[PDB]
Symmetry: D2
Subunit: 310 residues, 4 copies
Amino acid sequence: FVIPDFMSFTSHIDELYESAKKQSGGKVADYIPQLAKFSPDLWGVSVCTVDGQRHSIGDTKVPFCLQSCVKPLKYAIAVNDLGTEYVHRYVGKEPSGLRFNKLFLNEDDKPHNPMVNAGAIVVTSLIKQGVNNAEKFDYVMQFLNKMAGNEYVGFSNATFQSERESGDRNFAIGYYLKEKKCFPEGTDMVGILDFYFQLCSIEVTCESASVMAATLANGGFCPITGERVLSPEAVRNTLSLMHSCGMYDFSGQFAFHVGLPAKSGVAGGILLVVPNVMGMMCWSPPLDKMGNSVKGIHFCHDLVSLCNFH
Amino acid sequence: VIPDFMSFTSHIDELYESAKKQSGGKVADYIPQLAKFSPDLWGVSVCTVDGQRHSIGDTKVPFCLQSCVKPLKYAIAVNDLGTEYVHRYVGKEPSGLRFNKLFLNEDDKPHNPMVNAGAIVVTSLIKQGVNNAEKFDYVMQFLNKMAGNEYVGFSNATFQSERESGDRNFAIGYYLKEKKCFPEGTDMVGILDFYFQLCSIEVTCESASVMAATLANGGFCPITGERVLSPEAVRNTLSLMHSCGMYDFSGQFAFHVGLPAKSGVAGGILLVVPNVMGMMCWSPPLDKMGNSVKGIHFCHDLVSLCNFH
Amino acid sequence: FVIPDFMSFTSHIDELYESAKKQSGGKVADYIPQLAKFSPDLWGVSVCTVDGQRHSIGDTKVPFCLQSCVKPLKYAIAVNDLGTEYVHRYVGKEPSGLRFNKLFLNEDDKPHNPMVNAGAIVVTSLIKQGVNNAEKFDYVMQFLNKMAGNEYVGFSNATFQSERESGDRNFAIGYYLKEKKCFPEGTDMVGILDFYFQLCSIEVTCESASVMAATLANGGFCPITGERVLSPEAVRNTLSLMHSCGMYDFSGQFAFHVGLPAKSGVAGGILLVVPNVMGMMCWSPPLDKMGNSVKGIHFCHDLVSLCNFH
Amino acid sequence: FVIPDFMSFTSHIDELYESAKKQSGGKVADYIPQLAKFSPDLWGVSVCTVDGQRHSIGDTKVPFCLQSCVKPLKYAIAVNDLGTEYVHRYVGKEPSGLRFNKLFLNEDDKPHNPMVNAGAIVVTSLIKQGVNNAEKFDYVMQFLNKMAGNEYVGFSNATFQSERESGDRNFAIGYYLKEKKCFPEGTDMVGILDFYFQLCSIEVTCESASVMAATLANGGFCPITGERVLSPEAVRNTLSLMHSCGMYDFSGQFAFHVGLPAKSGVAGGILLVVPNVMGMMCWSPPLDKMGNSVKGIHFCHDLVSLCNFH
């Protein structure tokens, strides 16, 4: 009952879709063939409110991997499993002010936030200590399936292989973290990076990602099934981190124009959450210079200019 | 707004006693005019957007708006000129370092209007081409309109000490001048003098609470009802305060309180609850990082008790 | 004598001069009109051996300001007056590794070396404490006249006026040093900066600068007059500093190719010292991208390639 | 003979040795037991002139590993085999001004100098591209045997095993270099790091290291055998690099006090070269805060205070 029209709202959504469809685009990957095979013409939007209302426009049935949209999810899982005090004992909560792949730590020799690469690696290490990687992956997959309301969540072996054979910057970051002793006692760095690469290669559709964001919007209760999947503290911390450093150094400027918790991925996916209202996923393979889809950014700006929100 | 300014005032009056039982740290000691206030001073003022007021403690002792004037001067500049002209010279993103760091962003511009360089540049943008007397008169009239004709004054004793001890500010000003970060036809020394004058404007907790309430209301003074600021100006000011209001601590603050708050070196915390109220907390004691211990404790207790956030 | 013949050597120097004259050049000043009015065709070389032997080629009678070639001389004056332990109580003796006009101090909150701008400002603050600028300038000028063997040393007021109204970076450095308590007790920063600007404006010809370089190479004894002007410790420390960080971030590369104590100024001047052998001055307004005279650098490279020295 | 008496010189050497023997010492390793098993009382000095004159006092027949004293040797080998213009195409020649194990490159995305860890890794990569590690090790060992005049040069398997499983900072540096494509085409980073660890574990005696330094002092001609082992350009570049950044950030300060090309290892070894005169090795397990032997530094300071040298 939060938006009891879903007729003019969807009309405006389609209008914004058509308006943003006119954008040319940009380079997508230019470094690997796995992400360079997607044609730039693909562009889809999926909206899911906190009541179960759903609306998909464009091509929302084409699966794509969650490159950087899984960091809030893994952080929420870690917080729910362990607790805020324990999970923030190893990582910070302030924005670094530099690029996401820079090799440096704060004054406490800890990663600045769970959104940067080092913070993501540490948070991945924190999950299910002293267990085989297969069990960790099964646990994360079942958690994602429960969070998405039993929608389509799958694995992309080719993408995982490409990342594991191309991502040596993450290996440098992991070795640097191991040297500074930022990991919990009794962990294997190579296995941690393998699990991180496996997590980054999980693929979803636009509707499934919209439901996943709507779960965070609702406050840990799935809008479809109604089952409690996350504690309120985990959702609150995830939203705070996404609002603070969701888009890295650009994030603050984003908060100046859109002012919503959103996360951007390499695969051209923008996952945004309007708290107590709804969640959206916008997929557009073409990317701009700083690693964000031009169509997704244009759609978000047009939406925040149209409706009040913010 | 609050149909319980009776029991709500009781909650405020119990958080006041909860935060009073603290020892804390130092006061300031950088200028003699601020290392004089007794550590036991502790006051809270609250003004809702509907005009209801409530104060408890030492809310009638004037104190300088050392670093709490940056949001107000930024709002004045944006209202006078506009968002696109104001941000043509300063950025809108956090720097990730201390407020007095001598470095610019990738575009050779100050990172945000909250650091010292950004504050100086924004000060350079107010009432261009006029002498300092008229600039100060304009700013004081704007502040009087902002506070609903409450107590706003000037502390010359603080201004003289601050003016002769701002070596870092002079270095920042010369660095900005060398990098061509100022509008054409500006005297840097006069800009720094006007900055020192602005930092020395003193208010009580009542007037600061009214200013926070009028920021919460959207440019409309809760008491008088006169529109003083444009919606764009107050929206941008709130966004900047939420993003980088507490400098490198800001994110952590947003992790716990999640409200737009600004902290001064005179032990003042000006916090805004949008569409709800505006509050001012004064406690001259400061911790190791530069915030009042009593004010921070009060903010944490308030956000733990009431939902807000 | 150091050069038993001094006839073949003069022919070699002349042919090196002719070879270096063929260079085109670059920009000259671009920041002040006093140093930007010099025509690129000016190119002169002066040589003075430690035994008094002299040789001048080209237009060496045109005065020019000692912009940044006065730092070794002022450091030598300060060390001779005060002592190594007192002088280095305020400045370091190690290269910074960054640009010369960078605003940062070492781990001890002191200037890295007396060759960067901050170190030079501190050093000129250390000279003749407790006296007004007139007597300071008189003392420095008498010391320079003693160093040059009563050759031509003068003051360029137009250059001084141009500099004192355009040194914003120097003012920022001075205020930064004042804040960090890097100055001796009882000093006026503005007066120190004015004295620094006055010192940078002292002008000489190639002959006087060659005599100064020969005095440094001789161990404090002026080759012409034969009277001591500097203590051995002062000249040794000055030579060590010039070899270590004489050319700022390029210095090491210079030591990789030439391996001699050389100091470069923004007025197209190269002061070269061959210890126990001679001292040379090369003047060419044409400057390169990094702030060195193209003709002077070419002459130094060709000279070190031809003769052994070192 | 460059030293005609060689009787008073040895007497002064013994006096300096006795004077330095009174130093207390400091922590040696405190992180591994392999380097912590050496008793602090060990202290030896060996001197070899360019005429084949040898003199050693102390425990000069106790083998110890060449930890950081092998970087000049490997750089000289690479320059002699390949050429200066090709060797410096991948590494710089300027001091970085920071710690020796910092993860950053210069403005050209190259290691600052061959003395830092990244420069050493790249230099090791430059040697014998596309060849098995056994052949590379045999070539390096035979080159060291020829340079040392067929003295004792051996391998320490325990040290190599301990280093290859503890130095993750080197792995981080190698992965960072591989990300920036600082390596030559067709190289394996893991094999390069294994070869680097093997090279760092080569052990010698004080007498053999003294002969090794005297070979560089003589100018590529072994003082004992008389056979040409290195080109003059290689030894000149090695001496220039050692003088510029032999002791990393402290190096400049060293040049202010001692002013000689010296290299210091973490195994408590100082290898110093007096050009055209002699070469010395000083071994002392006791180490100071910045990673240098206290007895070695004190001996170098006393030696430079007693004789002129420089």
